[PDB]
Amino acid sequence: GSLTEDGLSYKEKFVVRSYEVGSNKTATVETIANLLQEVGCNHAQSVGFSATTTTMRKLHLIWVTARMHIEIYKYPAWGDVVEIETWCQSEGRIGTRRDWILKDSVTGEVTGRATSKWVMMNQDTRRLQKVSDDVRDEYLVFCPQEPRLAFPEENNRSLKKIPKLEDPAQYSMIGLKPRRADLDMNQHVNNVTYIGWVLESIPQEIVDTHELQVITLDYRRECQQDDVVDSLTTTTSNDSQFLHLLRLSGDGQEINRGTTLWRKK
Amino acid sequence: GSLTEDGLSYKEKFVVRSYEVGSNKTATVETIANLLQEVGCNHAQSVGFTTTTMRKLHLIWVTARMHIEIYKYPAWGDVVEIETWCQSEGRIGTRRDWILKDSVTGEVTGRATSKWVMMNQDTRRLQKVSDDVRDEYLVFCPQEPRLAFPEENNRSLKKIPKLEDPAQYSMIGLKPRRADLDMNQHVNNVTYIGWVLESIPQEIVDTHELQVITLDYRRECQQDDVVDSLTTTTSDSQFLHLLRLSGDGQEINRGTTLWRKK
Ligand SMILES: CCC(=O)N1CCC[C@@H](NS(C)(=O)=O)C1
Numbered sequence A: 001g002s003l004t005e006d007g008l009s010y011k012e013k014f015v016v017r018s019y020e021v022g023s024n025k026t027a028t029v030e031t032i033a034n035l036l037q038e039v040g041c042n043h044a045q046s047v048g049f050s051a052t053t054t055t056m057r058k059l060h061l062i063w064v065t066a067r068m069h070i071e072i073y074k075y076p077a078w079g080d081v082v083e084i085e086t087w088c089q090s091e092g093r094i095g096t097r098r099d100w101i102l103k104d105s106v107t108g109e110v111t112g113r114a115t116s117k118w119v120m121m122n123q124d125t126r127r128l129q130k131v132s133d134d135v136r137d138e139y140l141v142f143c144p145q146e147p148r149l150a151f152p153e154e155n156n157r158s159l160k161k162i163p164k165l166e167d168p169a170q171y172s173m174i175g176l177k178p179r180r181a182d183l184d185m186n187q188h189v190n191n192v193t194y195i196g197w198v199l200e201s202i203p204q205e206i207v208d209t210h211e212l213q214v215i216t217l218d219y220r221r222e223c224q225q226d227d228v229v230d231s232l233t234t235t236t237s238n239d240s241q242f243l244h245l246l247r248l249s250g251d252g253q254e255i256n257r258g259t260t261l262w263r264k265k
Numbered sequence B: 001g002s003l004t005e006d007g008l009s010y011k012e013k014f015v016v017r018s019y020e021v022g023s024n025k026t027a028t029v030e031t032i033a034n035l036l037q038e039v040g041c042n043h044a045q046s047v048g049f050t051t052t053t054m055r056k057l058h059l060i061w062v063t064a065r066m067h068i069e070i071y072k073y074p075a076w077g078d079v080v081e082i083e084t085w086c087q088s089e090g091r092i093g094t095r096r097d098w099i100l101k102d103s104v105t106g107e108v109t110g111r112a113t114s115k116w117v118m119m120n121q122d123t124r125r126l127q128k129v130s131d132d133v134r135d136e137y138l139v140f141c142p143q144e145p146r147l148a149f150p151e152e153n154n155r156s157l158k159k160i161p162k163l164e165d166p167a168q169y170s171m172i173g174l175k176p177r178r179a180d181l182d183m184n185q186h187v188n189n190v191t192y193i194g195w196v197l198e199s200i201p202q203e204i205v206d207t208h209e210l211q212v213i214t215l216d217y218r219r220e221c222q223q224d225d226v227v228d229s230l231t232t233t234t235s236d237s238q239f240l241h242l243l244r245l246s247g248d249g250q251e252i253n254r255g256t257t258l259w260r261k262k
C-alpha cells in the first residue's frame, strides 16, 4: 500500500485468503472489517502515528470508535484482489471520521463502502472529551479540506439513531467470552469481535438464504477479557432488517447496539 | 506465491498484519498456523486440486497431527517467506512440511510438519488410500525424502499421553463462532490451537515465548458442541494439554507445549 499523489488518502490491495471466506466462498464481513482496520493502521503509519499525536501521548489521550457503518454490494471471492482507499476528516470538536471505498482490482467497480466516527478519550479514566485546538492542528494537514464523504446522500443510513432492543428478544446467543485471538497488541477486545458476536444471534436459516448488505453498529462500552456477553436480535420488518443488542451476561450493562439489513441471494 | 523451479514445492511471502500480532508486537502462533494452511491451500490450487478422483468415492484428507517449532515470531510489518511440500508416508497417509524464513536475512525462523490421513467424509471412517490414488499425487512430491524435522528421535513423532484428572489449569465453556468455521462449516484446525492455549495461565504467556506445540487430532468438534480445555505443568516450561466435550468428556484433542523465558 501507499499514500495517493496528494497524500490526503491511502490505497492498499489485498488478496482474499482461504481461511477468510464463508460458506458462499466469498470473504466474510468480519474479514472486510479486519482489512479496513489494517488499511487504516498503515495510513497512520505512513504519515507518522502510533493513532496518537505528540500532544495525545503527553496527556494520556486515545482515539476510540463510537460508530461503525459498512455497506457491501459484492463480497470478494477467495483469490480475488480487493483495493481499499481510506482517508480521515475532522468533525469539529466532536472527533474524527474515517471513510473507506472498496473496489474490484480487475473491473474497478465499487463493491463496498464504510464510515466510522472516532472520539477523543482519556486512556486511564475512560472519560470522553472534545478535540482541543492544539491536537486538531497536528492532524488537519493529513485530511482533505473540502468534504469527501463515502456516504454523502441527503438521508443516509449511517447517521440514523439506533433504538434499544426490548425484552424478550426474538433470538439470542448466550455465554460468549473472548479468547486471546479476540484481543489486540494492547490486550483490548478487537472492535471486529463485536461484529461477530452481534451476528451470532442471527438465525442460521437467515445466513444460509440471505447476504448481509448493511451493518450499523454503535459502541457504548468496552468488553473486558474476563467479561461474558449476551447477543440479542429481533426482526424489525424482499429484505430483512434486524435490531441488535450486546450486553454483559450478569448485570445487563449495555456495551453495543446495532442494525443489520439482509437481501435474498 | 508460486511453485519452485522443479514444481516439487511452493513458496509464498506474507506481510504481517496489525490484527495478527500479540502483546509483544510479533505474530501469534495462530496467525502462523493460518499462514501454513493458506500456503498449503495455494500449493494444491497451483497443481489442480480437496483432492482428485477420491471425489466420487467421497474421501477427504484430514489432519491427524500438527507440530510447529518457532525460533523467531515475525514482527508487525515484516515479510515472512514460507516454503511447503508434500510426501507419501508409505500407505499410512501423507505428510506436509513447512519452512518459515526471514525475507530480509534469509534465516529459518520456524518450521512445521503435519500428518494427514484419509477418511470417508460421510461415515468418518479412517482407512488407508488405494494404489490408484497413491499415484495421482506422487508426481507432485519429491521422490527422495525431504524432512523439515529429520533428527533421529525428534519431538514431532513422540507419543502424547492422556491428561489425568484433576488438571492443574482449565478454561471451560468454549464454543466456536462463525469466524471459527471454514467454507464447509467445519471448525478449522487453527481454533483447536487457540482453545488449547486458553488454559495456559496469563503469567506464563506474559513471561514466556511459545517455542514448540505438538497437537494430536482425535475427533472433530461440531458447531453446536462445547469444549473444555485442560493443562498441567510437566516440568523451560513444558505442559500437557487436553480438549474434551463439556458434557460426556469425549476426547477431541491432546497435546504438549514448550515455552522459553523471554
Ligand atoms: C492517516 C492518519 C490520520 O490522518 N489521522 C487523522 C486524525 C485521526 C487519526 N485517524 S483515526 C484514529 O483513524 O481517526 C490519525
Ligand SMILES: CCC(=O)N1CCC[C@@H](NS(C)(=O)=O)C1
Residues within 6 Å of the ligand: B040, B043, B044, B047, B049, B050, B051, B061, B085, B086, B094, B095, B096, B116, B137, B140, B141
Ligand atoms: C500440492 C498438493 C499436494 O501435493 N497434495 C498431495 C496429496 C495431499 C494433498 N495435500 S495435503 C491435503 O495438504 O496433505 C495434495
